[PDB]
């Protein structure tokens, strides 16, 4: 977890060594709302992610989308593919189209290429990432 120059910690969560009441490091978490069950892996996990929707300083608000994971080769985020049909009126016919959306995935989720993920909008995480995985299936 401390695989870096800088120490990873949940901000403003203080662990008083003197009291030493419990072995486990105190961990702060929240529920994201809209009936999205926070997985237990987040509650009893040890990872630290400022962009996680359940333990980080990020809120899910706005559109909620669903897609299929197309790429998962990059650190803590994936690329999903949303497919749809665009309507051409002149020919009165449909046309298959698609768009790639990069989405941040918290380590609390284990996502493979091919599974269906429901993602919620959040504040701009990176240059292209504006969504956060909130449910996997």
């Amino acid at each position: 977890v401390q695989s870096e120059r800088a120490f990873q910690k949940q901000p403003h969560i203080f662990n008083n060594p003197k009291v030493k009441t419990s072995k486990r490091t105190k961990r702060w978490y929240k529920n994201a709302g809209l009936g999205f069950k926070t997985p237990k892996t987040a509650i009893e996990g040890s990872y630290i992610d400022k962009k996680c929707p359940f333990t980080g300083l990020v809120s899910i608000r706005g559109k909620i989308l669903t897609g299929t994971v197309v790429s998962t080769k990059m650190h803590r985020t994936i690329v999903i593919r949303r497919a749809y049909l665009h309507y051409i009126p002149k020919y009165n016919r449909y046309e298959k189209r698609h768009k790639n959306v990069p989405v941040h995935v918290s380590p609390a989720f284990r996502v493979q290429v091919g599974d269906i993920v429901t993602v919620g909008q959040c504040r701009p995480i990176s240059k292209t990432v504006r969504f956060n995985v909130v449910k996997v299936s």
């Binding site: 120059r5 800088a6 120490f7 662990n15 060594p17 240059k127 292209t128």
Partner: protein, 170 residues
């Protein structure tokens, strides 16, 4: 000359973007303030709106908090020891947030004897490492403020896992 605009950057696809418009004031940036240890020099900066930002060009004293004891004292900042982002800042003793720095231990020590009457005992017990630094006379602290914005260098004394990790890195 400094701008934060995203239009000059390439698109996600790899396409580049033609100049949509001239640079705007509401998307500006200002020169970094490499705060360094020394006699206090701070000058104000008029920012967007009527607000003001304080720029710390030099500073030598700052308020540091002992969280375990729940106290805060004003102490002299001696020198920068380790900075995670970049090490030439450590070389130049540049002060910024998250920089690990060394502070003199006299005020905390004096408060320790005053409160607990010891250079009761169970409460007076502290970490072995923290006592070792007291014996040294110098304490490792992490700066929690942003000197380039607020003009302060507040921080907190390292403890427990923080202190152990940074000692391993040192």
């Amino acid at each position: 000359g400094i701008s934060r605009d995203s239009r000059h950057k390439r698109s996600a696809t790899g396409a580049k973007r033609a100049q949509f418009r001239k640079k705007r004031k509401f998307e500006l940036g200002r020169q970094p303030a490499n705060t360094k240890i020394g006699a206090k020099r701070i000058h104000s900066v008029r920012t967007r709106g009527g607000n003001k930002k304080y720029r710390a060009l030099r500073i030598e004293t700052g308020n540091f908090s002992w969280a375990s004891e729940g106290i805060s004292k004003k102490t002299r900042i001696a020198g920068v020891v380790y900075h995670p982002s970049n090490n030439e800042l450590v070389r130049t003793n540049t002060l910024t947030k998250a920089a690990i720095v060394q502070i003199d231990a006299t005020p905390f020590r004096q408060w320790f004897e005053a409160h607990y009457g010891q250079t009761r005992a169970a409460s007076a017990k502290i970490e072995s490492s923290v006592e070792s630094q007291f014996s040294a006379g110098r304490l490792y602290a992490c700066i929690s403020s942003r000197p380039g914005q607020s003009g302060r260098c507040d921080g907190y004394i390292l403890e427990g896992e923080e202190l152990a990790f940074y000692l391993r890195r040192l």
